[PDB]
Amino acid sequence: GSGFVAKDDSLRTFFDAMALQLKEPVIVSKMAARKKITGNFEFHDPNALLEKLSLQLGLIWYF
Amino acid sequence: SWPFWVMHALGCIIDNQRGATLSSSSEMANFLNMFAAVVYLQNGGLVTMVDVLNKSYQLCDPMNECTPSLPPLLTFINQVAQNALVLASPVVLVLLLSEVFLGLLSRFAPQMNAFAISLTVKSGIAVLIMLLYFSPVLPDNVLRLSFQATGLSSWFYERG
């Protein structure tokens, strides 16, 4: 029913698409804006998807 | 400075064939060099002149020791030389065929001193034959020989 289809994005275009399923805006830094991603994702449980991606990609986040 | 160098080399050949330079053993070659400077400067010009040094910082950032990539540098002199000779092709052929055509008349009349007549007739021929292809043929090779930014990768490489 939902989901993003990423084709070589830049982690600032990507995490703003998750800023609707998360009810808050996302602010990504400029050193963490160089990494890229591809793939078919699905935003059905984003508070566990952001936690799993922040450990596979290597990131720290604070709300 | 590629297309200005071949154009200034063009005018030196046309100056040298007609006489007028034999005091060694130039203004005409300055004229083509100014002309190809202006016709390069009109359409675009400084936008591609600045773009190649904006790309040079994208492919030769310092603290990386990039070099001008020696093994394609060694064909640089003949690269402008084969552009010089084929651009000076049609007018030296008419001047040369006119000289031996006069020489057969010197063989048909011995005390003509056809060397003196050669200076009088070649300066009219060397401007007349190049007037036929000065307008429609010269200025497009000027835009063709302008070095463009896409080939900047082939002339450099960073060392670590």
Partner: protein, 184 residues
């Protein structure tokens, strides 16, 4: 037995005979060998035949192409004279390739020529095409306009579907019966 046109040739005489036979007057084609063809009509048909010559503006001139004004036998050739010779050969090749579709008897295609953009810093403009066509009758020619625009669209670099205009029409009624000789 009154001649009205002499010194014609092969392709012009078959158009003059086909025009005069449509309007109920006979014609005789008399060959003269080296001097070309000649056309005579009857004496009661001469006053009407001169009128149909003046209205249709006969004999027809030979058709002009753009590559005739820029011949390849010149010693030098500008880039304007090289793109005009390229476009005037594509304009005839699409015309000869449209006559092999199903039902089209004749066609004519036109391409938009561009001169000023190739020399200055201005970008090249869009490309416009225009076509005419004559279809065999009995065809539902409202559904035939989409195959021509689909064929003509990506036969070029960058055109759109609203820069092409096709105007086509069915052929006229056939003429099969003889005109008839003037009896007196």
């Amino acid at each position: 037995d009154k001649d009205l046109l002499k010194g014609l040739d092969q392709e012009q005489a078959n158009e003059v005979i086909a025009v005069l036979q449509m309007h109920n007057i006979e014609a005789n084609k008399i060959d003269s060998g080296k001097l070309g063809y000649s056309i005579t009509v009857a004496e009661p048909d001469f006053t009407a035949a001169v009128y149909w010559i003046k209205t249709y503006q006969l004999p027809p001139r030979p058709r002009v192409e753009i590559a005739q004004m820029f011949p390849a036998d010149s010693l030098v050739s500008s880039p304007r004279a090289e793109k005009a010779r390229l476009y005037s050969a594509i304009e005839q090749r699409l015309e000869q390739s449209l006559q092999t579709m199903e039902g089209v008897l004749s066609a004519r295609v036109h391409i938009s020529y561009d001169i000023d953009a190739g020399e200055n810093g201005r970008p090249p403009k869009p490309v416009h095409l225009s076509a005419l066509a004559v279809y065999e009758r009995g065809s539902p020619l409202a559904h035939q306009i989409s195959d021509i625009k689909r064929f003509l669209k990506n036969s070029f670099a960058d055109v759109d579907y609203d820069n092409i205009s096709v105007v086509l029409s069915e052929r006229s009624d056939a003429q099969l019966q003889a005109p008839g000789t003037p009896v007196k």
